């Protein structure tokens, strides 16, 4: 009979309770105080312009129909009490497919303080939509948003607020850093009003500033493109009479260049414009194509067909003696100006 006291209290709080009406329907505006604990910022899929985030989406409001007098003050109740009372219908404005986890019980709690204050935290994984501007790829920085607000209640009925200060109302856990490519720098929040055909709603926008780490693309796209240009520019160190040898340099370097041109944008979306990685590849294509037409220039001016044995042999060319210095120099000038104008932005 010790638990019959808490049985009488909980049944009295639901006797005459109508869960289709927000509290203070005819009196005031229901302030729902919210804060987010990010357990793990999941992987960012740049191919689908989305990102995954696991949150502890806490909410708190005040209901005057749930006052009680009893032994304890805060009732750490079960989960199924939350479906029997009014809960705010917060939805994410830019969510795509978000899942409330159900194992083993539903991952929600509900605490009812004795003055009528409520706390209602949910564990949710949000596949929100992050609009990107992949123009400075891969050295870009993004501010992926997460906008949430009420759906059926306008700004004269339900207004949102942060529980703690807005600087410390979205907290990222230290161990949850499931970004493998990007690098989370910090979070910023905001509040505003959106306009719709039905009315005016209170939106709650938070931004997660992300910066991409270019350590993958150096050893996948940049270094094999740089080593291809060096592979094309060793062709000026051969002799003029080795046509079959130098045309292997002139063909296989640009043929492995155009495969890297294909295989660089494979992960990238159908980007309408050209990224900064495509500008490096296009200049590197010009450096391996000019090496071939330099060989086409010197082969046209090669008079004899035999080679030095020590007869009058072919004398080395001024084109090869000038391309041995200028071609590593102008690629050095371009490499100095491309990285300086992009890494210090």
């Amino acid at each position, epitope marked *: 009979d010790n638990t019959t006291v808490f049985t009488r209290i909980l049944d009295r709080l639901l006797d005459g309770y109508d869960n289709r009406l927000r509290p203070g329907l005819g009196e005031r505006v229901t302030e729902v105080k919210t804060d987010i604990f990010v357990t793990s910022f999941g992987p960012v899929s740049d191919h689908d312009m989305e990102y995954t985030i696991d949150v502890f989406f806490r909410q708190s409001w005040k209901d005057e129909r749930l006052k009680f007098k009893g032994p304890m003050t805060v009732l750490r109740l079960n989960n199924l009490m939350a479906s029997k009372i009014w809960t705010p219908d917060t939805f994410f404005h830019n969510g795509k497919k978000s899942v409330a986890h159900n194992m083993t019980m539903p991952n929600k709690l509900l605490r009812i303080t004795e*003055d009528g204050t409520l706390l209602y935290t949910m564990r949710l994984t949000v596949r929100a939509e992050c609009p990107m501007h992949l123009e400075d790829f891969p050295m870009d920085a993004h501010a992926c948003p997460l906008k949430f607000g009420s759906y059926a209640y306008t700004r004269a009925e339900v207004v949102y*607020e942060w529980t703690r200060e*807005p600087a410390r109302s979205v907290v990222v856990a230290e161990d949850g850093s499931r970004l493998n490519q990007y690098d989370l720098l910090g979070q910023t929040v905001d*509040s*505003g009003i959106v306009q719709s055909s039905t009315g005016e709603y209170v939106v709650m926008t938070t931004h997660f500033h992300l910066k991409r780490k270019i350590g993958y693309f150096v050893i996948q796209t940049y270094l094999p493109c740089i080593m291809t240009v060096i592979l094309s520019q060793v062709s000026f160190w051969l002799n003029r009479e080795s046509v079959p040898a130098r045309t292997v340099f002139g063909v296989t370097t640009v043929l492995t260049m155009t495969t890297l041109s294909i295989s660089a944008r494979n992960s990238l979306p159908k980007v309408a414009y050209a990224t900064a990685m495509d500008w490096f590849i296009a200049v590197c294509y010009a450096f391996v194509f000019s090496a071939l037409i330099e060989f086409a220039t010197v082969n046209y001016f090669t008079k004899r067909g035999y080679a030095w044995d020590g007869k009058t042999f072919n004398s080395v060319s001024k084109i090869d003696r000038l391309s041995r210095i200028a071609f590593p120099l102008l690629f050095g000038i371009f490499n100095l100006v491309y990285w300086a104008t992009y890494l210090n932005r």
Partner: antibody
Framework: VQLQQSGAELVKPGASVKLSCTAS????????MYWVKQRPEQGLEWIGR????????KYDPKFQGKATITTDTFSNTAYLQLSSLTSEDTAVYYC???????????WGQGTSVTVST | NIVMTQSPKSMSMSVGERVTLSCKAS??????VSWYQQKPEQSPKLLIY???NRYTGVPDRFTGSGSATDFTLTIGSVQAEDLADYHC????????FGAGTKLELK
């Protein structure tokens, strides 16, 4: 609605002072309590805040170890405590509460402290 | 820590024209910027809570503009009951205030 503070006081340097801010028309347990320093011919200076639901307190880094707040729910009044006050701290103290967008909408009438002979 | 700079310190204009206050934050504050006036030997009150969101009871001539860093307070027509200095606060972090901006009438 109405925010009330006690009257002005005359204190010696090195002593301790007690100042109160009585709230009426609304309870303290749902809104923060903001207290702020207003020097003469100068701007405002926030010194600390109070969460009365759990007794949480955070101070200004300059005024750490300088002020202390206790809050009684039954009395509907929160209390100052200035332990090591000097003669330089001659100003007026204002009471405030958290508003709609973390503003300070309702303010007290202000109590001016005077540390002189 | 956040610091708010109000410019200028003081100004002198007459009744019924335009004034543009200025308030610039050290780092990003989103919208939580509060404007308070201080009538001499009275209590402060609230003009705009948030950025560009008028309080109840103040006239419609007071308006604000908000951004990431800079915030302006604009009065369309200065009246004879506006004898106060305006303080620009912030609330995105632990709250801080500017030095205020005095004004006078001829």
């Amino acid at each position: 609605v109405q925010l009330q503070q006690s009257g002005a006081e005359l204190v010696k340097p090195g002593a301790s002072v007690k100042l109160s801010c009585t709230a009426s028309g609304f309870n303290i347990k749902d809104t923060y309590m903001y207290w702020v320093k207003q020097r003469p011919e100068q701007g405002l200076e926030w010194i600390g805040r109070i969460d009365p639901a759990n007794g949480d307190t955070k101070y200004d880094p300059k005024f750490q170890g300088k002020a202390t707040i206790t809050t009684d729910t039954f009395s509907n009044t929160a209390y100052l405590q200035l332990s090591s006050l000097t003669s330089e701290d001659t100003a007026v103290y204002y009471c405030a509460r958290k508003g709609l967008r973390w503003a300070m909408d309702y303010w007290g009438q202000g109590t001016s402290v005077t540390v002189s002979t | 820590n956040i610091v708010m700079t109000q410019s200028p310190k003081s100004m002198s204009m007459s009744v019924g024209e335009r004034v543009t206050l200025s308030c610039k934050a050290s780092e990003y504050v989103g919208t939580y910027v509060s404007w308070y006036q201080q009538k001499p030997e009275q209590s402060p009150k609230l003009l705009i809570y948030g950025a560009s969101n008028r309080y109840t009871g103040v006239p419609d001539r007071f308006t604000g503009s908000g951004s990431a860093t800079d915030f302006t307070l604009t009065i369309g027509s200065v009246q004879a009951e506006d004898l106060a200095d305006y303080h620009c606060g912030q609330s995105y972090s632990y709250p801080t205030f500017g030095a205020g901006t005095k004004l006078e009438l001829k």
